[PDB]
Design a protein around this nucleic acid. Structure first.
Lengths: 369, 364
RNA sequence: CCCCCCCCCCCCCCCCCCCCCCCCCCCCCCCCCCCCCCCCCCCCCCCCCCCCCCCCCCCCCCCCCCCCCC
């Protein structure tokens, strides 16, 4: 009889963030550098110069990477993207003086990077006995992609500390950019990665510009070996800040008996509401946290603390949890879910139900001692 | 009920790589040689010259092959293909042969050396060299490209691995071509092609378009029909894991029923469903060096991968596959079952659908 | 013929609200084997054979309807 006692709050919460017919015009006076498509070779060389020699300062390293994206996406198509990201920022087309005059980037810095690289080229060409192959020169076309791959690794760990990201970036860069490091052993991964964190934090609109480069690159027929790596780093970044929802499906897949607890059963409708909002938002739902979108956070499992406890317990038991700081509301439920998952982890079973074999093939399978 | 706990992440992952309304313009200043259709006979002769004599350097051998493709596809239709591959590279029409990027010195060397070999041999042959042995034979560019096709198949592995495979197979496959042009240096020609496919990435999809185009024609050459057949064995590029996955199902490996493997079912399904979502281009994704590729990775399902590999090992297919084995335990088990399966002979009188007078005689 | 009674409606009470709480935070490139396809045999046809053929107009009876009351 007691039906009708129900509020679909989370859907309404989202519905209100669509009703805004009015659009925000933030970053009113702001100006950022854009490079026309025509200067792609010049910016490619500059990218290579950053990797090629051990430089004094890697401040603008990230802005140079964005400048390659600019050439790749569009002379002026970039302004469109930035305007549409919500930022009313204006663009400034970088010129030549032969060198590059990038807006916001100190002329002194550009000259330093070039000077230092030429010095290193001269030292090495004397040793090599005038023999430096194409693949080791700052002129190699994949050098901007290599630069951006360090940015891609810091992009993945934008969800945590400026610090945490640098660890992960360095560790993975060693395995991932293995061969790039062989040709440019002078690339200072930590300083380059720091420039990218600083950039993504200050110029928030460059987060969605990076996403658009990724989206665009992901579409092309033929990609570079370096390009195909970039997108693959970018993909591992999809479940950004939603680690809890993905571990939630893992808890269901593990068939953790704690998901059947009466206190957890009570939170079912809230949990369902969150997963149904993901479907309501579609593909953009995943990269919401990555874009630093204010909309994000509606995908919080704060409303269901007992469920979160079980999900984390299950993750701990299976040995996935690692260094996740996520608070555990119900310590009791966590420990229980953990125990079951640990017992599950070790136990070996065979579903002859799933296989769908003849009971003459299922007969022979039993014979396996 | 506990059912709304589902994320179709892999589909969304792909869906995001379609939403890009903006297009990448890479290779901004780049220039590559194209040969107009009109010069097909001249480039045919040059191809034959590479095979006919033992040359000092086989650097541009691959670029010459691409130049024949250029004549075959279109005087200027080639620019369209390259532009549409994602590369904004510009083309340069080769004049009278003065091929763009190819040293005039090299062209002259190849010609000079071939004429020298023709003169030496014509003295021995007593002025008698049949058409089929001359660099002028029309199938010489196809022969050249077939060496390229073999290195195209092994673009998934080392520059090295590919050369082994290329040489081995070329001996059996290009058996008769080698009889007429015994001077063709398969390893140097194959090296030129690896270098080319690695440097000029847009030529990978140009090669694919030649293959696609050749595959369509009503009448092909004996050499042409070979080229496509090499190109076909290249379809399951980098997806060896998914194809061995169907083999594990066909073998009815009981390890696919393991609880830990059963847990990964939804991820595995998601990958095979993405193949269907992408359709025919799905296969050659890895071959094109497409950034899109890699979404077809079975990294998300390590226990399944372990079983698939175990099954392959047991059946004796695995060969020289370096693919990492996450669950050594599951692998060994799947391997044991597959080895027992391999030897065992059984008959499904259920499948055959015989009369129980034919099924009577079969027991005998 | 039908129809034939009775008949306004309303009329109390009553503000709403008042707690708590940012979210997030782990890990992770992918790839990697083998492999040209084909290959046998094979003209088809071959006979017989016009169908049709009988008989047979149908029709043929009887019958206005309506008719009360209100």
């Amino acid at each position: 009889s007691l039906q009708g006692i129900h509020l679909s709050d989370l859907s309404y919460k989202h519905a209100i963030l669509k009703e805004s017919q009015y659009t925000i015009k933030r970053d009113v006076g702001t100006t950022t550098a854009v490079t026309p498509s025509s200067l792609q070779q010049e910016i490619t060389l500059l990218c290579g110069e950053i990797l090629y020699a051990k430089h004094a300062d890697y401040k603008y390293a990230a802005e140079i990477g964005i400048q390659y994206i600019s050439t790749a996406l569009g002379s002026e198509r970039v302004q469109q993207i930035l305007r549409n990201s919500g930022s009313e920022v204006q663009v400034v087309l970088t010129r030549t003086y032969q060198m590059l005059d990038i807006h916001g980037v100190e002329k002194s810095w550009v000259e330093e990077i070039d000077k230092e690289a030429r010095k290193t080229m001269a030292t090495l060409l004397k040793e090599s006995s005038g023999n430096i192959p194409q693949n080791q020169r700052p002129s190699a076309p994949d050098t901007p992609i290599i630069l951006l791959c360090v940015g891609a690794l810091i992009f993945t760990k934008l969800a945590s500390t400026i610090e945490v990201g640098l660890e992960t970036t360095v560790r993975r860069a060693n395995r991932v950019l293995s061969d790039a490091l062989k040709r440019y052993p002078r690339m200072d991964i930590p300083k380059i990665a720091r420039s990218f964190y600083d950039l993504f934090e200050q110029k928030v609109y460059h987060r969605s510009l990076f996403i658009e480069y990724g989206k665009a690159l992901g579409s092309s027929s033929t990609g570079s070996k370096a390009e195909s790596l970039f997108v693959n780093i970018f993909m591992q970044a999809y479940g950004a800040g939603q680690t809890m929802l993905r571990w939630g499906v893992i808890a269901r897949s593990s068939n953790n008996i704690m998901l059947g607890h009466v206190s957890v059963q009570a939170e079912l409708k809230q949990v369902t509401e969150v997963y149904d909002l993901v479907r309501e938002m579609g593909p953009e739902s995943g990269l919401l946290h990555l874009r630093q979108s204010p909309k994000a956070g509606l995908l919080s499992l704060a409303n269901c603390p007992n469920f979160a406890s079980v999900v984390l317990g299950n993750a701990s038991g299976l040995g996935i949890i690692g260094m996740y700081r996520g608070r555990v509301p119900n310590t009791e439920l966590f420990s229980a879910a953990e125990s079951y998952a640990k017992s599950l982890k070790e136990s070996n079973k065979i579903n002859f139900s799933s296989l769908g074999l003849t009971d003459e093939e299922k007969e022979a399978a039993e014979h396996f001692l």
